[PDB]
Design a protein around this ligand. Structure first.
Ligand SMILES: N[C@@H](CCC(=O)N[C@@H](CS)C(=O)NCC(=O)O)C(=O)O
Ligand SMILES: N[C@@H](CCC(=O)N[C@@H](CS)C(=O)NCC(=O)O)C(=O)O
Ligand SMILES: N[C@H](CCC(=O)N[C@@H](CS)C(=O)NCC(=O)O)C(=O)O
Ligand SMILES: N[C@H](CCC(=O)N[C@@H](CS)C(=O)NCC(=O)O)C(=O)O
Lengths: 284, 283
């Protein structure tokens, strides 16, 4: 019967999902400077649920004509360890996407953590975060909630249900029960409010949709049936409402490398890229 | 064992926190929350997440910010107090800490410890830099904490410490990550006195009760396992922050175990630290 050691040590031979990238130590593995484009915002990211939050926000800002939200979204393949380049570590020492630099300052200001990037963009431009203190505070409560909940959905439920090479009943049960509890909190909130934090769409919706909205629409971990996604009537209503917004349809495909080819735009350097550079146009 | 097509909730599970954990949210009983005389009403327990907030409130009072006066009411999460109707009304997620600011009508509810730290920093104007670069870097680390603690607590703490059955696969996954996060923090503190820069902020208050106390042996009985003495900069900073007068006080609010002089079950007036700690209630 297994007993932990007095002092944990790393077995590099264990293998398994993300074996090639996960380590007990942080920092750079190689020297590479990040590319920088002509736009004021430089984003270094991948179209996972956390990258999508940020590119949905950027697209929503552009739809309101916000010229300062123009951006270059450079692809960082986390499977290849691009997050451990010297250049990437300088923008985010935690080596996770998304990471952004705002080049309208000197020196440029780095922003890492998807939730921090959403708050930074909301404050910078003044949209998608209410002015009223009570409404702003509710919006922040739900944004934080997501930032504290996604780790359970991804690092817990998604890991054990989808990626782990061994199906562990105790861990699947613990993390599926919690993912359901979180969906239930979200469902009972959306029963009473059009959007997560109230009557208006905010950065809280943008943070939550790529995780909880996509999970119930079948888009993450092949888990909608296992999670009984159809039982969360109000999550479904809201996930379809937010998912149909034109800026969400564009934001959700930026830096995306899975799904239908016509729903992948591997980098974004101008608005016209959506017309000409999606992966369905690059098959020859 | 193979997962089902659709997960169903069995009982017969009696593992750690199995008696409070459910796949559904909402109240288990009806009870109103107590309300005291002070402007800020806190409903919490002195776990790492409660301590973030009581530290901030004590730091603000140390600066003479009288509007941070607070009632810190005890919520016993092991008794299901987080599932009363009154508690669900302040935080529909049923976790502590949760706070209401009764200087508004209706009072403004604030839930998630990181949301509370931000709300208080913005309300009073302390512990969140005004310079945009420094402000942004403080928020990066605060959000980093809020996204990292789930792995330290609901992963590492759960599988290493609380679960009586030690599941090697899970313990290796979450220990590795705990150490990676410690190393991030150590490499940052190698270059900076506080987590976000030169000055103490809400980011230190968020991170200390988790990563600071883990390295000092205060959480999960894990310092040896984690090789915590290897993170020299986390140790330096953890000791430096722990010496702060307001940290010494904040860390004991709503604590219900440990030495008697390190337990103040509720805080309802500043003199409670002199009169009403569990050691002083000894007759
Ligand atoms: N708390 C984070 C989590 C970010 C995150 O988990 N990014 C993942 C991809 S979605 C990643 O970069 N993983 C790289 C790795 O684990 O090495 C945030 O909200 O930004
Ligand atoms: N993301 C959270 C987590 C809060 C949390 O995990 N609270 C725990 C105590 S430290 C809790 O109330 N647990 C009660 C339960 O799980 O039923 C926050 O930062 O406030
Ligand atoms: N270090 C990895 C990389 C995979 C990954 O980073 N997953 C992301 C989603 S793409 C995640 O669970 N993020 C948690 C969060 O968003 O807080 C792992 O072993 O789980
Ligand atoms: N629902 C429980 C209760 C235990 C609990 O709430 N743990 C807190 C620490 S006291 C936690 O890990 N919080 C995670 C966070 O702060 O994000 C669990 O099964 O993990």
């Amino acid at each position: 019967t297994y007993q932990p050691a007095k002092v944990w040590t790393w077995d590099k031979s264990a293998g398994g999902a993300f074996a090639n990238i996960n380590r007990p130590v942080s920092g750079p593995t190689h020297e590479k400077t990040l590319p920088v484009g002509k736009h004021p915002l430089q984003l270094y990211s991948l179209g996972t649920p956390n990258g999508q939050k940020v590119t949905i926000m950027l697209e929503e800002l552009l739809a309101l004509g916000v010229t300062g939200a123009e951006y270059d979204a450079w692809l960082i393949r986390i499977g290849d360890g691009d997050q451990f380049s010297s250049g990437f570590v300088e923008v985010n020492p935690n080596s996770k996407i998304p990471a952004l630099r705002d080049h309208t300052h000197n020196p440029p200001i780095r922003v890492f953590e998807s939730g921090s990037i959403l708050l930074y963009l909301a404050e910078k431009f003044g949209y998608f975060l209410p002015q009223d203190l009570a409404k702003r505070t509710e919006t922040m409560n739900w944004l934080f909630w997501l930032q504290g909940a996604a780790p359970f959905l991804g690092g817990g439920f998604g890991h054990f249900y989808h990626y782990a090479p061994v199906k562990i009943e105790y861990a699947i049960n613990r993390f599926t029960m919690e993912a359901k509890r979180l969906l239930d909190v979200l469902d009972k909130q959306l029963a009473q409010h059009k959007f997560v934090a109230g009557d208006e769409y905010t950065i809280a919706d943008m943070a939550i949709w790529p995780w909880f909205g996509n999970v119930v629409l079948g888009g993450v971990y092949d888990a909608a049936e296992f999670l009984d996604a159809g039982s969360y009537k109000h999550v479904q209503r809201w996930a379809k409402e937010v998912g149909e917004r034109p800026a969400v349809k564009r934001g959700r495909i930026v830096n995306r490398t899975n799904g239908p080819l016509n729903e992948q735009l591997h980098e974004r350097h101008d608005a016209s890229d959506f017309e000409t550079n999606t992966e369905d146009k690059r098959q020859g």
